[PDB]
């Protein structure tokens, strides 16, 4: 029915300074900086103070209003990302063939290289996304670890690995083999 306005807040923590011209968002904090382009959306940002920013929609419909919150979320995860950071963990899972995973470099690129999967002679590859770094988690068996300031680049680099490891032509129930995302969180601990 068109809502005459609904708005959202975006809190700002002590280390970061977000800045937004047109609808091109830049958040700079202790752990680096990311930027993201909201031009496709039609909201109106507003500084209220150095720790508060409102985001609002005037005379909006359902789908409009319903994009207000996801704007808030997206810029929020930029702020959390640039402070606490993001850490995705994945465990390998196999029932007989030990899945063997390492990081290779051709023409300077960093790829996740997965061999032996379900027996397979073929060698699987996933590139490392810029901004995400990869530690083979010591002290824990068959665990891989993807960190970085962008949830979206880590979560995607995650999902790329786990999808290079789908099982064809078998009962995917019985044959549960894979690399799966096993815990999502932050980098800076205690938080």
């Amino acid at each position: 029915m068109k809502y005459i306005q609904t708005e959202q807040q975006i809190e700002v923590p002590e280390g970061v300074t977000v800045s937004i011209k047109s609808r091109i968002v830049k958040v700079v904090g202790p752990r680096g900086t990311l930027t993201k382009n909201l031009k496709h959306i039609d909201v109106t940002f507003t500084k209220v103070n150095n720790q508060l920013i409102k985001v609002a929609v005037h005379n909006g419909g359902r789908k409009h209003v319903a994009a207000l919150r996801t704007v808030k979320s997206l810029v929020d995860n930029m702020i959390t990302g640039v402070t606490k950071g993001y850490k995705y963990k994945m465990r390998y899972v196999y029932a007989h063939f030990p899945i063997n995973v390492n990081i290779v470099e051709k023409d300077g690129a960093k790829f996740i290289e997965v061999r032996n999967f379900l027996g397979d002679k073929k060698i699987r590859n996933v590139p490392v996304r810029d901004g995400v770094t990869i530690e083979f988690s010591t002290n824990v068996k068959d665990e891989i670890v993807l960190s970085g300031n962008s949830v979206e680049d880590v979560s995607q680099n995650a999902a790329d690995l786990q999808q290079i490891c789908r099982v064809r032509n078998k009962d995917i129930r019985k044959f549960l083999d894979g690399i799966y995302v096993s815990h999502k969180g932050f980098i800076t601990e205690d938080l």
Binding site: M1, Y3, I4, Q5, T44, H58, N59
Partner: peptide
């Protein structure tokens, strides 16, 4: 009906973008 109460709130203002 809400599409009306909407216009009764105090000190009401809105832009026309």
């Amino acid at each position: 009906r809400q599409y009306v109460k909407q216009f009764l709130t105090k000190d009401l203002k809105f832009p026309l973008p």
